[PDB]
Amino acid sequence: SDPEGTGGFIEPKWLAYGEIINGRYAMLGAVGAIAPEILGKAGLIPQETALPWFRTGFINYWADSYTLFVFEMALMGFAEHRRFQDWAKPGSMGKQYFLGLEKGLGGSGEPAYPGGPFFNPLGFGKDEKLKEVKNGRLAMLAILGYFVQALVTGVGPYQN
């Protein structure tokens, strides 16, 4: 049958709750701070013809370049909509191998978190003494947002 797409007060919000959750670790720059020593800046159009920003940043880059940028975001977007179909369910994913009884070996199950199950029961001594895990990382997202253009330039920190 024809594919589905139910709107209803607030799908737009479940997938809109989700969009920012992904963007909260695609926040990247300060979540994984080792990520950019200077990688937040993409480094457009600075040909051995010419130039970057403008006075920039200039004492954008060496680089990790290239092409094959569309093929990625498309091809691995050709997976985002599969853990969205496959586990509609009727399970058989573990096609195993025709012969061989020696395949008890499992791996996990369906995972969310420390894995197959949680696992290794046995725990607490010290470590010690649903959306807040969402809310605070747009309070990390939209923050670099203005920090791209984060300048007064002609002048600077009035505050100071």
Binding site: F54, L151, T153, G154
Partner: protein, 730 residues
């Protein structure tokens, strides 16, 4: 209908004769219903007896206009791009004479394609892109080629919002049937946030990128595709980066400035398109309002309020049903939208807002008559649709005893006056001219009405024009010139190719056209006024809202009993307005060229396209084909074998099509029946006709194929007559 209603078929209705009132298109065959179907296709007395949907259709099948205006414009930006002449023309204006369209040399074609400027074969333009396009804080041909697909973007999407309505299971009542906010929004931030947003991209980028164009260069020897960011360093030439001010207010010092704006009025010597150093300030100074303004409000309250003695008790209550009409809240609109378009048509020609207009003569009068026929074609409408109200829209009579029930109370009255108004005019408003003929052909000028024989004496001046160009000495601040250079007082020096605007003098031969307009504007309106007013009931027929606002004519009795109705008042009211506009046009160019347009050289001895021939000689209404129609038009009937030629070569058709209207306008109906059978007979002998009962035209269809033709005839006639006497000398 009946078909499957239910619940029980996605299976769409493709196949089973008919739909549209109920002994419908009947099994039994006929033709009338094929003009039915297209006509009245949009309407509402059928589809359902229940509002609901309709507003759920009109907010959709609306949409596909924007999207369209949007597929359109694209093929115009594309067109105004790679079918170039814009690049070529801009380094080289005063010089060029622009194109966008070009044939392909199939059959006869090519004659139509005739050297236009930056070195190529094509057909010209009187549609002032290439001049909005001055704008381009950037320039580049492939660029417009982005603005272009940027267009097709808005479209497909601003056209899948129309899937994303009606066809999608729709909003409802409250959504519009709560009106409470609508203009709140609209005027505040778009009306505002455009004009506003337009400010930001109207000094940022445009001002500078023609601040130093108004001199020379060849583009990209100027205005990069990014260049205009943070770099507030070239914004250095065109005022401070605020230097020491912070977000206006006052603890500011000017020992030598006052931000961009520094208000102009007049006209760039080198590009008289009016100054831009202003154009930001005025759009800014708009938006604010809208920005403040769209912040009412929530409705009745304000109209539920001020009444009086004879005034409007029903003022109070002036329509619950103004959330429950459309046909009403469309007709109101058209009068404004419409009447608020031809107010363009002036402030344009006596105050150009684009670089290179006036000098560009033909590329802003086309305008001033295109814009001019909407500020009229939209007004008779703005009446029709009120008639459509006055007859039907509401369910019952819940609306009662008010401003209207009032106006109607008198009605053989408001239109009783207005009438005499017109014959007072007409006699003072046309036979006025006819004097002249009868007495200038008699010939005794002593006694004409000349700008010089009947007592008036070498001055017009002392009125209000002369207290306009001279007002920069009131509460007025100032700024060299006026507001509109065409005013009485001071100044001359305007432009170095040809001319632009200068005073524009008056008296008589300006006095009386100005009056024919009155009488023309008035008797137009009489017929629409009395038309929409007497919409539903009368003492020629009271049983007279009983079908719809059309209906052919009630019937041979009562004497006449034919025209009546109000489709038809909006049929003979078009008939006038075609004049209303068609003679106002006739006015402007005969002025604007008899005086104004003309030209400088040494000692700027001015040389109008015509040494004011107007003078003593429009006053004669023959002078109007001595000096007009037979004078100019000599360019239409010379126009063969050329490049424009498509005008002369239209000017025969369409000067034919009109003279085909009368046949549709002037004739019976069981006539072409009585005829259509003789035909139908000869048909049957060979065995070749009956199926789909061939039928003559639906009394009022017939009038539909009058009128519409009479106009698309009688009109493009001049659309040709014109473009052919501004292209080429003028």
């Amino acid at each position: 209908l009946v078909d499957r209603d239910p619940i029980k078929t996605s299976f769409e209705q493709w196949a089973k004769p008919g739909h549209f009132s109920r002994t419908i298109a009947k099994g039994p065959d006929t033709t009338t219903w094929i003009w039915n179907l297209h006509a009245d296709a949009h309407d509402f007395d059928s589809h359902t007896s229940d509002l609901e949907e309709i507003s759920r259709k009109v907010f959709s099948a609306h949409f596909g206009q924007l999207s369209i205006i949007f597929l359109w414009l694209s093929g115009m930006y594309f067109h105004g791009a790679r079918f170039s002449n814009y690049e070529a023309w801009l380094n080289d204006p005063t010089h060029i004479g622009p194109s966008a369209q070009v044939v392909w040399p199939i059959v006869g074609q090519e004659i139509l394609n005739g050297d236009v400027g930056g070195g190529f074969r094509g057909i010209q333009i009187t549609s002032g892109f290439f001049q909005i396009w001055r704008a381009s804080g950037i320039t580049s041909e492939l660029q417009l080629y982005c603005t272009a697909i940027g267009a097709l973007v808005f479209a497909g999407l601003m056209l899948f919002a129309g899937w994303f309505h009606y066809h999608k299971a729709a909003p409802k009542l409250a959504w519009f049937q709560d009106v409470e906010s609508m203009l709140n929004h609209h005027l505040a931030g778009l009306l505002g946030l455009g004009s506003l947003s337009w400010a930001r991209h109207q000094v940022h980028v445009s001002l500078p990128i023609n601040q130093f164009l108004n001199a020379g260069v060849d583009p990209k020897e100027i205005p990069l595709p990014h260049e205009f960011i943070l770099n507030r360093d070239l914004l250095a030439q065109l005022y401070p980066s605020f230097a020491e001010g912070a977000t206006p207010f006052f603890t500011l010092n000017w020992s030598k400035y006052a931000d961009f704006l520094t208000f102009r009025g007049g006209l760039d010597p080198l590009t008289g398109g009016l100054w831009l150093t202003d154009i930001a300030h005025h759009h800014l100074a708009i938006a604010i309002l809208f920005l403040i303004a769209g912040h009412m409000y929530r409705i009745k309250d304000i109209l539920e309020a001020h009444k009086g003695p004879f005034t409007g008790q029903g003022h109070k209550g002036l329509y619950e049903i103004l959330t429950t009409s459309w046909h009403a809240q469309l007709s109101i609109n058209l009068a404004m939208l419409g009447s608020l378009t031809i107010v363009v048509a002036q402030h344009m020609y006596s105050m150009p807002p684009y670089p290179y207009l006036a000098t560009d003569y033909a590329t802003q009068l086309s305008l001033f008559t295109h814009h001019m026929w909407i500020g009229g074609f939209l007004i008779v409408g703005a009446a029709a649709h009120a008639a459509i109200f006055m007859v039907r829209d509401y369910d019952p009579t819940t609306r009662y005893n008010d401003l209207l029930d009032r106006v109607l109370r008198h009605r053989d009255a408001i239109i009783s006056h207005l009438n005499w108004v017109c014959i007072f005019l007409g006699f003072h408003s046309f036979g006025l001219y006819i004097h002249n003929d009868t007495m200038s052909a008699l010939g005794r000028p002593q006694d004409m009405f000349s700008d010089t024989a009947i007592q008036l004496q070498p001055v017009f001046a002392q009125w209000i024009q002369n207290t306009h160009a001279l007002a920069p000495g009131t509460t007025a601040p100032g700024a060299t010139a006026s507001t509109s250079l065409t005013w009485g007082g001071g100044d001359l020096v305007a432009v170095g190719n040809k001319v632009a605007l200068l005073p524009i003098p008056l008296g008589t031969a300006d006095f009386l056209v100005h009056h024919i307009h009155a009488f023309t504007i008035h008797v137009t309106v009489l017929i629409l006024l009395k038309g929409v007013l007497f919409a539903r009931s009368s003492r020629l027929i009271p049983d007279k809202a009983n079908l719809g606002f059309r209906f052919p004519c009630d019937g041979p009795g009562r004497g006449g009993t034919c025209q009546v109705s109000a489709w038809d008042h909006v049929f003979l009211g078009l008939f006038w307005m075609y004049n209303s506009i068609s003679v106002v046009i006739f006015h402007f160019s005969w002025k604007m060229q008899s005086d104004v347009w003309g030209t400088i050289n040494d000692q700027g001895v001015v040389t109008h396209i015509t040494a004011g021939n107007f003078a003593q000689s429009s006053i004669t209404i023959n002078g109007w084909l001595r000096d007009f129609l037979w004078a100019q038009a000599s360019q239409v009937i010379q126009s063969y074998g050329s490049s424009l030629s498509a005008y002369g070569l239209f000017f025969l058709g369409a000067h034919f099509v009109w003279a085909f209207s009368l046949m549709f306008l002037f004739s019976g109906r069981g006539y072409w029946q009585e005829l259509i059978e003789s035909i139908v007979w000869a048909h049957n002998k060979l065995k070749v006709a009956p199926a789909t009962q061939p039928r003559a035209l639906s009394i009022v269809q017939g009038r539909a194929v009058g009128v519409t033709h009479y106009l698309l005839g009688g009109i493009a006639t001049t659309w040709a007559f014109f473009l052919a006497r501004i292209i080429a000398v003028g």
